[PDB]
Amino acid sequence: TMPKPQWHPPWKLYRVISGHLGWVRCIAVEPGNQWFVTGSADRTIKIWDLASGKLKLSLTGHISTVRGVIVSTRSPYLFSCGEDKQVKCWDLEYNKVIRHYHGHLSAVYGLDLHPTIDVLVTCSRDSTARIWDVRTKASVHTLSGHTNAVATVRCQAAEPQIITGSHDTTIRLWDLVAGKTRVTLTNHKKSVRAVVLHPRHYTFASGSPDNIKQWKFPDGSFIQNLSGHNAIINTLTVNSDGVLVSGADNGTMHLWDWRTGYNFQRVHAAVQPGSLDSESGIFACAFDQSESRLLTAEADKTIKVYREDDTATEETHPVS
Amino acid sequence: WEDADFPILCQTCLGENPYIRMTKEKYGKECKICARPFTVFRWCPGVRMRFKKTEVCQTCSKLKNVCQTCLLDLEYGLPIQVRDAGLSFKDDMPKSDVNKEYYTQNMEREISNSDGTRPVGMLGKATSTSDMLLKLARTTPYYKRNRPHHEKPTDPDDPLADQNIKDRYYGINDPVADKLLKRASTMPRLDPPEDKTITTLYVGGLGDTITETDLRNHFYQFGEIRTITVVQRQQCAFIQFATRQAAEVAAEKSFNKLIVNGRRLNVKWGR
Amino acid sequence: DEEELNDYKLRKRKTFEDNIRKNRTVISNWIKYAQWEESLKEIQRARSIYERALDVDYRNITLWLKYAEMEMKNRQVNHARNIWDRAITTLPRVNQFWYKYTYMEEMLGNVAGARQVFERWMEWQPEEQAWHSYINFELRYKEVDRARTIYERFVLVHPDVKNWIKYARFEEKHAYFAHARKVYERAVEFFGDEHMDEHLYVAFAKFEENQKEFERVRVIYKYALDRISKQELFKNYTIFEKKFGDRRG
Amino acid sequence: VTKQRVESHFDLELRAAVMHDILDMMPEGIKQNKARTILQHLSEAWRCWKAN
């Protein structure tokens, strides 16, 4: 029912970090694969060297969980956002807050910086999202309409520029400038938390308890229903070679190929020493810039780092 | 954002000049009814005339389709009291502030989801014409209105001077409509007979061009007719209709309008 | 009557309105108002109620069904059609809606509009039961070509050998043994060596048995078991018993 | 958020996060799993952790 799926070598766990004192809610990578940022519910924000796996820095911004961060590739800025109703921006030469965009009403849940228009787009459990001027603390649009907490946003240059998925189980595509709803999709049954945009196929996938779904831009054409990783899914991350990663809620991490939707690996990770298994979980993922290694921030205060498997061949690992 | 790129006004509020210069100021003022910021149009209704504006939300102009700068029915030129009372339309647009503003914004959402040409709601559903409305209608352009409000100023004892715009729109206490409604109540109409058994229609002035053929041809629309007796002696035609409801409909229909071959023949109760 | 019933009307109107006022929730009070005013046969008032509750919650199928059934009872065919199309436009998966709607098409008698609605419906590829309601409809009139075209699109939208076997049984029932032999041949062609299984080839052996071609029955049975997956134990045994039946009978 | 409402706030955020997560995943008690009762059991589990 499909052309024979390609062969991607599996992934093996090799390096494990344990430095936080709470859940690790979000994690991002620096433009040049030298260091990655972590934001936790311990309220810290910790910068780590990507090579030596050593904690380069820690900074005590928030008042509660840091629910999401993002590093600027057009500046030495780093934007944090947390359930303290507030969003902050750090200069990373002087390591300090430089402006704070007030305005939301409840816990921010996630955010993204638009690659070319210098704005932020942040989603919040207050049933909205907003578009922020970078510098001047100006919000141009309250992208509104989701009947509940806008569980995530991703933004991109092309039309449409803003996709937001929610606990209303809907997905919504917005025109940025008029700040208006353009299109809705409502295929899902259970809330939808993870949306990811392909780098070179003008497409995007959304995850929910039921299973992943795939769509074609700019319209919202359903494509290809991906099933198999039946667990509350928390982040989707896609790689250069079409490797697509779904981190589930309960630790079970699943891999597939983007083209055929071929679930070709299940990794089922082991918790730290002191953590009961029931505290297992995955909360965010990110491939490095060079896309060789993979970071995953788990729900037991640890950051696990997987590497492409080098000893893999078609016979070591056949495709079926 | 209430935004009109067109004005909703009859020729009466428009002005006599076929070439009108009109400026628009968006959100220049809130709706006096809706409290909604809408585009106000400013244009000179004539040389030596008042340079007027459009002041209502397109909600308010659309729902009751009163010429926004005339507040007059764009089809009837008539005040809201006379219009609604002639279409028997008791328009219960709520009086309270919350209900008024919210319902005006709601009829505005309904206007934007309607073609914007025909009214959104119940009054735009009673397009059943009124003969008394035709009687009250003024088909001439009241350009002298377009002048400003050097003459003896409006007398305070005449109940028209103090102009009540809000109630005169929302359906209460229109003085000019009350006067014209007294006029259209005292206007000539066919009173029904106390003697119930005669379906006896007299036609006075039927003339030499109308024969019994064309007479019954006009009489056909209202119901069965038993007998016809024309007298060129009195230029009259006495028709006995078979039905009482038929004769009543024929009476109200042909009273003061029926023109058979150009001339109005007096439809009267028989004697 | 004149005023004593008007009193009753004001009272209970305000009671219903006050109840749904305090609540704004469950359409129990809504629907009871709908029936209050349909028993008063104020159809426009009850319809306004219906639309107000539609705005309250546009997602109640029994609410839409109350609407439609009231329209059927008070004969407002065009408005019932309006309601029907609105629903099915809004909830393409509520097959109660398509079912009762095409039922309405049959009641009004317009088999043409029945066909059209069934057509718009099959676009959602609803389900085997939907195609089969479609085919029972199409077979309340003869329409044999339409019948087999329904079957042909159906067994491809739901490409199940069992659906194909229903197609084959319908072919036999309507005496198209030519097209039915072609049904089974094309069916094994499509299903291919990869995944095909017992029931199809036992069915082919049995059809050819009824055609009295025992030699071809046996070439079918053995050649198929050799070409495809064979074995496991209960399948081999039952197939061998059906082959014994094909031989003897 | 200010040191006064830190506790009440974080509590609100926690209870609601629980509601979202499970009582959108665990159902198939679809009507309402008596979430309110599952949250009563939450509170009781806490109490008992506090009292060992």
Binding site: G145, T181, T184, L185, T186, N187, K189, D210 | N106, R109, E110 | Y58, R59, T89, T90, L91, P92, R93 | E28, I30
Partner: peptide
């Protein structure tokens, strides 16, 4: 009054057995 509700392009439910109905 917001924009009209888009059709709920949805799946059908598969009802609750006694097993998970008690589970």
């Amino acid at each position: 009054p917001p924009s009209p509700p888009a059709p709920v392009m949805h799946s059908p439910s598969r009802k609750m057995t006694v097993k998970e109905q008690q589970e």
